[PDB]
């Protein structure tokens, strides 16, 4: 059944709750972003109102074939009324079209639902500055102090420098970058820009990127693989056997592959700086795992929460085990006692 942490009290609203059939009492289904664990259950057969960003609405219409009459896109940073309740959608700094949602309850309570987010100090000057938040529904994916990672800017600098060096030393090297969802588009875009190539990809993935309102996208991507030296492949294919195979397919145009797997956190973060990361190599294939995250580090999450000072926190991630739930509740209490709220 629908878990309590997907229900917004005092409304007829649910958040990222599409895989439980008709939720008893739900008059509007909000969708925070287009990632499969969140939209799971949506299709062309859905006949309830869906509220979301413009970009998520593009993906719903073109990828899932949801009928236009049920898609209700809202602008960001704009006070809107939905079934008699004031809401605002805010940038979540996650993947394209991802939003946090502010609900202003008729009784006077204010609820923020982060969806998935990578907390940033820029949020401290959004519309959130302007009033008090009583209840926070929080993306706790990385809520433990072992989870450090570098800025997105440092990671892209490493990737650009690595790729440019490799291809300038060998003009017959091909660059490959893995993907299995929207998000992390900067990694392949920034690499293609430094090399003066378009990024080449399958028709299905090109279709996906063309829904994301990225400016000048027609100049940056293509379905003609032959004309491109940065290829995107399914994440599953980013291994020595799948890459060797791919190399055969390029018909002797290339004699070397340099590949990137943008992961989330991995345990080598707890020892190694970005400046010191190395690849796994077999023959003329090298695979780099780079810690490009679109979730909050432990320190970023903690800063956000200590700034916001909510009265109650409801985790939405890692809620399935008692050990995880108890660990999270300990950190919450530490933070409250240190900051004084
Ligand atoms: Ni996500």
Curated annotation (Swiss-Prot):
Covalent S-S links between cysteines: none
Coiled-coil residues: none
UniProt note on tissues of expression: Expressed in brain, heart, kidney, liver, pancreas, placenta and skeletal muscle.
Effect of residue 139 to N: Impaired nuclear focus formation, reduced interaction with PIAS and increased sensitivity to cisplatin
Induction of the gene: During mitosis. The mRNA encoding this protein contains an internal ribosome entry site (IRES) in its 5'-UTR. This 5'-UTR generally suppresses translation while specifically promoting expression during mitosis, when cap-dependent translation may be impaired.
Location within or outside the cell: Nucleus
Origin superkingdom: Eukaryota
Cited function: May be required for DNA interstrand cross-link repair. Also required for checkpoint mediated cell cycle arrest in early prophase in response to mitotic spindle poisons. Possesses beta-lactamase activity, catalyzing the hydrolysis of penicillin G and nitrocefin. Exhibits no activity towards other beta-lactam antibiotic classes including cephalosporins (cefotaxime) and carbapenems (imipenem).
Protein family according to the UniProt entry: Belongs to the DNA repair metallo-beta-lactamase (DRMBL) family.
Record-given protein name: DNA cross-link repair 1A protein
Parent-protein residues present: 700 to 1040 of 1040
